[PDB]
Amino acid sequence: TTKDVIQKGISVVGDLLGVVGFPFGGALVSFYTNFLNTIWPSEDPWKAFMEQVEALMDQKIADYAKNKALAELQGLQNNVEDYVSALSSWQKNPVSSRNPHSQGRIRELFSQAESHFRNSMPSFAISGYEVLFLTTYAQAANTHLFLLKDAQIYGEEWGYEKEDIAEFYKRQLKLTQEYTDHCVKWYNVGLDKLRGSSYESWVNFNRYRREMTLTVLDLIALFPLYDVRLYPKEVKTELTRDVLTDPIVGVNNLRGYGTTFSNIENYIRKPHLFDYLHRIQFHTRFQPGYYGNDSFNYWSGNYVSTRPSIGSNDIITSPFYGNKSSEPVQNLEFNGEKVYRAVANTNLAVWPSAVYSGVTKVEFSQYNDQTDEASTQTYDSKRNVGAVSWDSIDQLPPETTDEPLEKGYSHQLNYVMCFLMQGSRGTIPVLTWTHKSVDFFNMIDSKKITQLPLVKAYKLQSGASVVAGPRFTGGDIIQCTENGSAATIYVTPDVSYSQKYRARIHYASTSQITFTLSLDGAPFNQYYFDKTINKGDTLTYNSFNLASFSTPFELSGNNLQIGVTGLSAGDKVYIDKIEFIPVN
C-alpha cells in the first residue's frame, strides 16, 4: 500500500538529482513541468501525504487543521503554475521581447509565490500535528527553496534591484537551516514514538524509518545544492544511506513468535564504509507437514559477502545468520551485477496446534552495466514452493515508469540477513538496499562540481570510524578523534589532460584544525580550518561548515588521503564530504 506517494517521493528526488547546483535553462523548465504533474497537479497528492503518516502513526490530523492545510495548498498550486508558465515563456522567448513591462509581470508572479510560501508554512506545522504533517511540510519546504534559488539565476534579467536579489538570498539561507532542522527534529520524535518490544513494533518502526527516508530525508539532503552561488555549476552527487525493506514472512500474524525488537534492531548493519553485494550462500531446511503431503523446504539461514568501495579488493564475509543447512547449500554470485529487484514465494504448514511458514523461493533481477544486459538468478528450496507473496517493487518503486525497470530502478540489493523466530519456529529474512545514484568508480567529473562522501573511502586509519549521520547529509559520516591520517579514498579522473581542481570540505570540528591532502602518499594541499562546534554539542544544520583549500591541483594519482592535526584530548572532527571544483 501507499506505493503512490512512495513513487512520487522517489521520483522527485531522482529528478532533482539532475537539476542540482546551477542548472541549464532547458533542464530547469523540463524539471518544472514534471514537478507540476507529479507534486502540484491537484489536492490528491497532498491528501495522500497526510494519510501516509496517519497510517504510519495510527493517528489522525484534526479535520480543521487538515482542511486549512489543503486550502493553503490549492492557493500555492495556482501560484506555482502561474509562475512556471511565465518562466517557460521567458526561457523560450529571445532576448529581444524582454521589455520592462514583461519583466514586471514575471517579477510580481515570483514575489507572489515566494511570499505565499512563507505565509503558509506554519499551517503544515501546527502544534500537536508536526509529525503527521511531515511529508507535506517537507514537500512544501522543498518547493519554496527550489523556487527561491531562481531569483539568483534570473534576478537581474527580470530587472530586480540588487537589494531584492540579496534579500531573497538571505531568506534562502535562513530557511534552508530552519526547514532542515524542523524535519530532522520531528522525524526523530516520530521514530522514538514507535520504538517497542515486539516484532510487530519493529516492523512499524522500520516502515516509518524507510518511508520517511524516501519522502523526507533524501529530499532535505538536496537543499544546500540549491545555492547556485556556492554551486555555480551542475553538481554530481549521491545518496549513501541504507534502507531496509519489510521482513519477508508467510503469515500476517505470528502469534508471538516474531523475533523481538531488540533482537532485530541491535543486529542490523551498523554504520560502515560503503560496499556492494558480492555473494549469497543460501541454507535450506526441511519443514515436515503434519500429513507429510504438506511439507516444504525453506530458507533457514545465510552468509553474505560484500566487496568494498573501489580501491580495495578484499572481500568481506559476514558471520553466519540463522540456521545451518539440512539440505544442499545454494550459492549465487553477483560480481559486477546490480540487483534491482527481488520477488519471493512463501509457504505454510498448518499443524494441529502450530503453524510453520517460510521463504521457499527468491528470484533476483540483475543488470550488467558493462555488457548493458539484464537477467535473473533464483534461489529455490526445491520442495513445495507455494506462491509469490513479497515483491521489492512494492516498497522500492522505480524512479521512472517511463523506461524499462533495468534502467529506471531506484535501489539495488546490498545486504541479506536471516533472523530466527522465537522458540525457533522459523526464519525471517531481512533485505538492505542502497540508492541507484551511488557511483562505484568515485569519478571526478571535469565539467561539474563533484561531491565525494567520505563513507566511499576503502580504508580508515589512526582510529577514525564511521558514525551515524545527522539525518540531513544523505548518509553516514566519519568521526576523527586523533591527530594523523584518517581516510584513504580511491578517485577516478574522467579526463586524460592536466585538468586543475579546487577542493572544498564539508566538516564539523570542536577546534581549529589542519586538513592535509595527499595523492598516492605525497602531500599537495594543507590548510587551516575553523572550529564549528563546542565539545559535546549535538549535530544540527549549523554545526557543519563548507570551506575551500587555497591552492589548485591536478589529479596526478588515485589514492586521496585526508589527514587531520591540531586535535587536543577530547576534540572531535566529523567529515561528511570532499568536493572537487574544475578550475582553469
DSSP string, 419-433: EEPGGG--EEEEEEE
| Phi/psi at 41 (5° precision) | -80, -40
Backbone angles phi, psi at 487, to 5 degrees: -145, 150
Task: Decide: 211 and 1 in contact? Cβ < 8 Å.
Answer: no
Give me the DSSP letters along 88-110. HHHHHS-TTS--HHHHHHHHHHH
The CATH classification number of 230-240+438-584 equals 2.60.120.260
Residue 3 φ/ψ, nearest 5 degrees: -50, -30
468 φ, ψ to 5°? -55, 130
Whole-angstrom distance between the N-terminal and C-terminal Cα of the chain? 52
CA distances from 220 to 139, 180, 232, 488 (A): 9, 6, 20, 28
As a whole number of angstroms, the longest Cα–Cα distance in the chain is 86
E strand or H helix at 141, and its extent?
helix 134-154
Q: Which three cell numbers stand for residue 257?
A: 513468535
Length of the chain: 584
d(C-alpha 134, C-alpha 318), whole Å: 37
Contacting residues for 518 by C-beta, under 8 A, at least 6 apart: 524, 559, 560, 561, 563
Three cell numbers written together for 68: 486549512
**Spatial separation of the C-alpha atoms in residues 574 and 566, rounded to whole Å:** 14
Q: Is 113 exposed, middle or buried (0-12, 13-18, 19+ CB in 10 A)?
A: buried
Give the 3-state secondary structure of residue 384. coil
C-alpha cell recorded at residue 435:
540508492
Taking the C-alpha atoms of residue 414 and residue 433, their distance in angstroms, rounded to an integer, is 5
Q: Which amino acid is at 137?
A: Y
Amino acid in position 317: T
Contact between 268 and 417 under an 8 Å Cβ cutoff? The reply is: yes
- Amino acid identity at 405: L
Enumerate the domain spans of the chain: 1-229, 230-240+438-584, 241-437
Contact 104, 168 (CB under 8 A): no
**CATH code given to domain 1-229:** 1.20.190.10
Q: How far apart are CA 574 and CA 565, in angstroms?
A: 13
Q: Would you state the torsion angle of the CA atoms of residues 143, 148, 154, 158, taken in this order, to the nearest 10 degrees?
A: 100
- Residue 546: φ, ψ to 5°: -115, 110
> Helix (H, G, I), strand (E, B), or coil: what is residue 525?
strand
Other CB atoms within 10 A of residue 498 CB: 8
Interaxial angle between packed helices 25-38 and 3-16, expressed in degrees from 0 to 180 and rounded to the nearest 10: 170
In the block, which residue shows the cell 553538481?
Answer: 235
> For residues 362 and 366, what is the distance between their CA atoms, to the nearest angstrom?
13
In the sheet that 373-380 helps form, which strands lie side by side, from edge to edge? 373-380, 354-368, 338-351, 387-391
Minimal CA–CA distance to 120: which of 79, 151, 83?
79
CA atoms within 13 A on the CB side of 175: 28
Query: What is the identity of the amino acid at 249?
Result: V
The reported resolution of this PDB entry, expressed in Å, is 2.9
Distance CA 528, CA 3 (A): 48
Which one is the CATH code of 241-437: 3.40.50.300, 3.90.550.10, 2.100.10.10, 3.20.20.370? Answer: 2.100.10.10
What CA–CA distances, in Å, run from 450 to 203, 229, 355, 482, 582? 37, 16, 54, 28, 9
Amino acid letter, residue 535: K
Beta strands in 369-436 (DSSP E): 373-380, 387-391, 411-420, 427-435
The whole-angstrom separation of Cα 477 and Cα 453 is 8
Reference 32, options 94, 88, 102, 74; nearest CA is 88
Antiparallel, parallel or unpaired: β 235-236 and 449-453: parallel
Which DSSP symbol is given to 217?
I
Amino acid at 374: A
One-letter amino acid at 268 equals I
Task: Enumerate the β-bridge partners of residue 275.
Answer: 308
Residues ≥6 apart with Cβ < 8 Å to 121: 137, 140, 141, 144
Place of cell 540531513: 472
